[PDB]
Amino acid sequence: VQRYYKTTVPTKPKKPHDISAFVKSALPHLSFVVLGHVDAGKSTLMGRLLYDLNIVNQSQLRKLQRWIMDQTVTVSICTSHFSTHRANFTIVDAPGVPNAIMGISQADMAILCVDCSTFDLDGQTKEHMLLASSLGIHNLIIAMNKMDNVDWSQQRFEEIKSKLLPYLVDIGFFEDNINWVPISGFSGEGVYKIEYTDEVRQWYNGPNLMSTLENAAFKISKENEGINKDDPFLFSVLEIIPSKLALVSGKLESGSIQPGESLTIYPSEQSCIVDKIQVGSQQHEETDVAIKGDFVTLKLRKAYPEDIQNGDLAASVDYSSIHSAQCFVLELTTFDMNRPLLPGTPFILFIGVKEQPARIKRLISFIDKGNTASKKKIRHLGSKQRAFVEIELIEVKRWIPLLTAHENDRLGRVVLRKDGRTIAAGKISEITQ
Ligand SMILES: Nc1nc2c(ncn2[C@@H]2O[C@H](COP(=O)(O)OP(=O)(O)O)[C@@H](O)[C@H]2O)c(=O)[nH]1
């Protein structure tokens, strides 16, 4: 308590492995979150998917056609793992907006499920895409859905897209990271195992949902081919399973870990040794190498669970960039707000799977072009602007570990809300420790 054992000298692995080797040899993996409006087909689509996967029954599916996550101490996010012969996947979902944030934060990319039936670019669709890119998601698959109620009309498909695409781009996306797939969650056409109808093939000639997913995965798996031992290990603690030798579950956001190697957890700053890396939907199956992107469970020696919590951060013992703070600077981008932001204006900071009250402490400067700090004086921050800002945490019960977005692009992002409205996104630029 007064001090946990802590080191900055790497222990070696019981059975050293060639990371680059192990990556190549290994199957690609992708995690994704399934967003979309309330009546867009999210669950019938999910059902259909699992069904083609022989994970859902033929009747389990007829019931759904009139839970699904459940079927496949504090829980932060739900995961469901699955596999094809080409790739491994991990559906991510929160249980229970704050819940969307959790899902989005741990997912590699998003599938945006859209109702094509007879377009109104609506409230919670836009919300989700806004959170998606605020939170670090670059890749999308827009599952253009419910094609039957438009008889697979290329005319309509292309019409909805011409509305949505520009929005997605404005909001912060790039057109080549967006993939557009026509499907029917109900007929299962284009999802996985039921092929596109010939009528449909004469205009849509790109891949189906599943293949598109596998494609994503491969794209990812390649970047991870570089991974060295000169690469930091980063790991979001996502759940702590009770002991009666602790079990820690989370997502690697960087590098790799093998049994024998060591890690420090923040903010507790304990240095534990990992002696088993459990993985798979079970999580009895074990590997000798977890790498970035993998959802896994570490079986830790020298761990003190009372002082570990969801949303904590583990890293290489020689990695010294995670910090806790009252104050830090946000490169802040602002949406449409009711009132402007002023020094002292409080809000809730959302960050990874944690949320936290805070207030603006300083308005430091507008951002004119590129990244330059405009000499224009700034007494208040209004809607649809960007500025460097100093934030202060209030009523802190426990330190939040922070990483700047230069250190890591994903972990370094935060979403700001006040009075129930998503008001701004931010990149952590600097930490005033
Ligand atoms: N015509 C058609 N209807 C669908 C399709 N997929 C879902 N639906 C229906 O549209 C509504 C969307 O509800 P649901 O599946 O729960 O989507 P969610 O509530 O947004 O997750 C339900 O009545 C679905 O059964 C589809 O591919 N074609």
Curated annotation (Swiss-Prot):
Region of interest (G2), residue spans: 73-76
Region (G3) residue spans: 93-96
Keywords in alphabetical order: Cytoplasm, Elongation factor, GTP-binding, Hydrolase, Nucleotide-binding, Phosphoprotein, Protein biosynthesis, Translation regulation
Compartments, as annotated in UniProt: Cytoplasm
Residues in tr-type G domain copies: 27-222
Family of the protein in this entry: Belongs to the TRAFAC class translation factor GTPase superfamily. Classic translation factor GTPase family.
Subunit structure: Component of the Dom34-Hbs1 complex, also named Pelota-HBS1L complex, composed of DOM34 and HBS1.
Name listed for the protein in its UniProt record: Elongation factor 1 alpha-like protein
Species: Saccharomyces cerevisiae (strain ATCC 204508 / S288c) (Baker's yeast)
Gene behind this protein: HBS1
